[PDB]
Amino acid sequence: STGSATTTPIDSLDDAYITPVQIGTPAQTLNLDFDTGSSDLWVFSSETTASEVDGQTIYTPSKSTTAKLLSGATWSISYGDGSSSSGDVYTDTVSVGGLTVTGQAVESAKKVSSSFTEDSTIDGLLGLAFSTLNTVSPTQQKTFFDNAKASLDSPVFTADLGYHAPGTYNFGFIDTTAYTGSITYTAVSTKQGFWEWTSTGYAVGSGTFKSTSIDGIADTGTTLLYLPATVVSAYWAQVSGAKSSSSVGGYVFPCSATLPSFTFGVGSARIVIPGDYIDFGPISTGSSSCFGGIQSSAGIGINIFGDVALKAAFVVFNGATTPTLGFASK
């Protein structure tokens, strides 16, 4: 089997992408944030505290003839941005882009943190990291991809995120028309539950490539590119007037600037992030200070190849017995 679904930016900055997901019978379609940095499929629901729902579409398990309470199971998750959610668990039929999994754990939120409530466009998350990170207790549950894998034509999914435009998540096949050149594959460590890999270096604009190992994760659920402070300083030093602002929370730059590209290495291959992809717009409405799309990871503990980096590539998440990642230009 295969599946293919379009993923759409939630706003004009590409802060996140939403993909329609069919849950239950008859189908209830929710728009979920596909997140290769986490491993829970959780949804706003008829059980979510009413004051914490503000415009989201909810899953109502009592209206699904295939829903079953997973007795005794609870979940609770906290994300790298400080947001969180928790609740109980149903199993139900879940379909993405024509690919159907029966008995998928659907984690129904009883509580969500304010950042979720305040984002009416995201109805929940669909985790695509390794199932070892799933938070369901006392019986850990499998991700949608883990449950689908054995049925897929090939045990892979691909992320093809658009810049200020829709893109595609495919399951079970690699669309050879969706990228240019060849796909360069690189080793993955699953020891932390992530799609963790090592970039071979970087360049700023037309500058020379610096060969240096940068360990990080491929994370579709993170908006920005978070890299070591040395790398980030080297980038922003090429933008007149750019500076790190402790009050804003990162590097800002004059909105009048033209940003240089940023290149990252995948083996001997190179992925070029155009400068425009690094502009996240005014820090507040009407400001001439703009927020940068490349930020320091120093306060995180891990480097994160988020959407800024991934949307410059066609990315293969190869879930074979020994997982690997693939990157191609497009």
From Swiss-Prot:
Q: Which residues pair up as cystines?
A: 255-290
Class of enzymatic activity (EC top level): hydrolase
Keywords, alphabetical = Aspartyl protease, Disulfide bond, Hydrolase, Protease, Signal, Zymogen
Instruction: Tell me which residues this entry annotates as catalytic.
Output: 35, 199
Q: Which GO terms describe its biological process?
A: proteolysis
What chemistry does it catalyse, as a reaction equation? Hydrolysis of proteins with specificity similar to that of pepsin A, prefers hydrophobic residues at P1 and P1', but does not cleave 14-Ala-|-Leu-15 in the B chain of insulin or Z-Glu-Tyr. Clots milk
Protease recorded as keyword: yes
Q: Tell me which residues make up the Peptidase A1 domain.
A: 17-328
- Stated EC number for the protein is 3.4.23.22
Mind listing the GO molecular function terms for this protein? aspartic-type endopeptidase activity
Q: What family does the database annotate?
A: Belongs to the peptidase A1 family.
Name the record gives this protein: Endothiapepsin
**Organism of derivation:** Cryphonectria parasitica (Chestnut blight fungus)
The gene coding this protein:
EAPA
Q: Which part of the entire protein is covered? A: 90 to 419 of 419
